[model samples]
Target: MTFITKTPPAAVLLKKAAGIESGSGEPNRNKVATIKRDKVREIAELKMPDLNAASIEAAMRMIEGTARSMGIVVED
Candidate 1:
């Protein structure tokens, strides 16, 4: 018998990090939550396998872009 472990999708992880509900509608830019760059880095590391990115930097940018689209601010 074989057992497999599955990781959650990137969007789910992002929403969790931002403290947003999974079923919530898109957030407004004015009142959106913010995530620090360090958190983004951690997400990228966890998501590297699915990101198709050649480097950590590229993966981070991809995650950052997704955060922006979801109205989450990426702070330094």
Candidate 2:
């Protein structure tokens, strides 16, 4: 008997972005988000127009940590 684990959609995307694996099946022209101060700000603003500084700062930190973990450094 064999068991297989299903990868979540977000996990699939993350792996693809990291070049860990290519997209499954079909013609796969991969894409990835290039995070930067301006890009993050743009996304946050578009996603949550009314977001406050405290909340935005927290989000920025979270994104920074995650990016750093993936070797995607964000220089200040």
Candidate 3:
């Protein structure tokens, strides 16, 4: 599993794809589908259910989708 880090940087994103970028401010209790400082609750949820090593490793690829959506660089 990827190491949990608050306010993960590009390096963390590069390690895996489509991963959530923990906010550096207040906790993101219910804000997944969208990212914002504060707005509405129950925004979304990330289905990061526990997975096997292989499955977890596979998830690294999924972050690519998020990177594309966020228009962020997908480090090689």
Candidate 4:
């Protein structure tokens, strides 16, 4: 199964950036709070926002865009 045309795996990109966290059945409410200043700066340099602030709508858009760019089609 796919989500917005991308498999859930792409969610790892945001999580690994130290930007977001997966709710391994549960997630920290302040996960985004732990993002270090330097990391935030890094994402900013890349023109992306820290994950906590990422709107669900936007995340979906990003996932879809990335998948398309990588030649992954949205599962019909």
Q: Write the per-residue lDDT of candidate 2 for residues 1-76, one digit (tens) a residue.
A: 3354653333233334444465566643345434446544444454433335466776566445545566555442
> In order, what is each prediction's RMSD in angstroms?
6.3, 8.5, 13.7, 13.5
Ranking by lDDT: 1, 2, 4, 3
lDDT per residue for candidate 1 within 10-67, as digits (tens), equals: 7767878865555667754476557788888888887777748988878878888877
**Global lDDT scores for all candidate models:** 0.75, 0.47, 0.38, 0.42
Highest TM-score: give the candidate number: 1
Q: Estimate each model's TM-score.
A: 0.66, 0.38, 0.27, 0.29
Between candidates 1 and 4, which one is better according to TM-score? 1
The 10-residue segment of model 3 with minimum total lDDT is: 36-45
Model 1 regions lying over 4 Å from their true place: 1-5, 20-33
Tens-place lDDT digits, model 4, residues 21-66: 4445554443223333343334333544435436444544554454
- Better model by lDDT: candidate 3 vs candidate 4: 4
lDDT of 3 by residue, 1-76 (tens): 6677654554343433333454457553444434321111111113234233244334554454444456444442
Name the candidate that leads on lDDT: 1
The C-alpha local distance difference test score for the whole of candidate 4 amounts to 0.42
* Weakest 10 consecutive residues of candidate 4 by summed lDDT: 31-40
